[PDB]
């Protein structure tokens, strides 16, 4: 915008001098050589055409030194158009999860008090659910602070930002979502390993589990961060996506879904093996299977294999209009209406009474 109309012209007036039938000039787009009469002035696209296409490597515009004549492909109608205004789509699915992650946060801040206060429920199992509960609050409070550096209100401002602060909030954002896809992975790994190797010390696994609940994401976001800051930084860490860089953030996220989903069916073989022995079924299998759907994060398998430019933005209503309430479902299913808190909240309600 406004800055590069000086900045790319400031190097142009250098190279106006460095570079005559035509004159060498700045056409309010790019720079020119004082070129030859009749020859075909073919210079490639500027950087403003690399954002219109992932196939931007073929964007070319032809002007002839006749003197200076028109672009033989005209600029915007070559690439910039796209057969309307979809700000209604982007704003509303943005303004879902802001009130989406809101409802989980006020119903997890209250619902994490109850597990760490009433002191009967300091079991080994709810020493896992509290870290799933705290890794939804780290999802929400990072997304809001991620959303703080997107309220631009000015185009020349945020297109030219490149500060270290809009790096650090981004890299903190990437750590505080990949931990949420690991604290759904371990949740299935705990309930599965409490049911197949049921003869083991449980002070052994749980401490050795929560290391790779927070530490194993802490390795990967850094290795992704140091393959752009030392190697391939262009904007502040959102819009490069060079497909050998996403696959160390996207990669071991969706790896922790495929190996989580085999643990989901690996329990409903075991749960049906007891529900069918004579000691009806399909309604007891109803709220047994459906109670594990937000626990395992199992609604991510539907788009895990499908490519991002294949499914084409239908999933964003799914993943952010149902994934941004996943933190709010989980605090109702096991904490607000648990089945062991309910006869225990009846203690302090009446005994204080």
């Amino acid at each position: 915008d406004d800055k590069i109309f000086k900045k790319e012209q400031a190097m142009c007036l250098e190279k106006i001098q460095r570079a005559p039938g035509c004159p060498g000039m700045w056409d309010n787009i790019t720079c020119w050589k004082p070129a030859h009469v009749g020859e075909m002035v073919l210079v490639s696209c500027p950087e403003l055409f690399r954002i219109f296409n992932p196939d931007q490597d073929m964007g070319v515009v032809s002007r002839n030194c006749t003197g200076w004549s028109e672009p033989f492909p005209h600029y915007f109608d070559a690439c910039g158009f796209d057969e309307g205004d979809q700000d209604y789509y982007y704003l509303s699915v943005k303004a879902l999860y802001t009130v989406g992650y809101s409802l989980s946060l006020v119903a997890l801040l209250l619902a994490m008090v109850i597990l760490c206060r009433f002191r009967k429920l300091h079991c080994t199992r709810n020493f896992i659910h509290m870290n799933l509960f705290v890794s939804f609050m780290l999802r929400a409070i990072s997304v809001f602070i991620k959303d703080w550096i997107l309220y631009a209100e000015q185009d020349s401002n945020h297109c030219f930002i490149s500060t270290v602060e809009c790096k650090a909030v981004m890299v903190f954002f990437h750590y505080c979502v990949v931990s949420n896809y690991f604290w759904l992975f371990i949740e299935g790994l705990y309930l599965f390993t409490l049911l197949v190797e049921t003869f083991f010390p449980e002070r052994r696994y749980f401490y050795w589990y929560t290391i790779i609940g927070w530490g194993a994401p802490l390795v990967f976001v850094t290795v992704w961060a140091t393959l752009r800051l030392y190697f391939d930084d262009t904007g502040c860490w959102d819009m490069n996506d060079s497909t050998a860089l996403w696959w160390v953030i996207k990669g071991p996220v969706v790896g922790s879904i495929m190996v989580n989903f085999v643990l989901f069916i690996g329990i409903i073989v075991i749960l049906v093996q007891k529900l069918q022995s004579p000691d009806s079924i399909y309604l007891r299998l109803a709220r047994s299977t459906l109670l594990l759907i937000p626990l395992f994060g199992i609604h991510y398998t539907v788009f895990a294999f499908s490519p991002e430019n294949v499914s084409k933005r239908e999933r964003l209503v799914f993943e952010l209009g149902l994934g941004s309430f996943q933190g709010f479902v989980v605090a109702v299913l096991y904490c607000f209406l648990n089945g062991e808190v309910q006869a225990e909240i009846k203690r302090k309600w009446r005994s204080w009474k």
Partner: peptide, 27 residues
């Protein structure tokens, strides 16, 4: 990564309007 690509898709769309107000002056 769902939140990752929406932060990519909205930011890329945010850049197009920055070119668009810039290209009304060269229009």
């Amino acid at each position: 990564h769902s939140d990752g690509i929406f932060t990519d898709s909205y930011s890329r769309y945010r850049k197009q309007m920055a070119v668009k107000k810039y290209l009304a002056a060269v229009l």
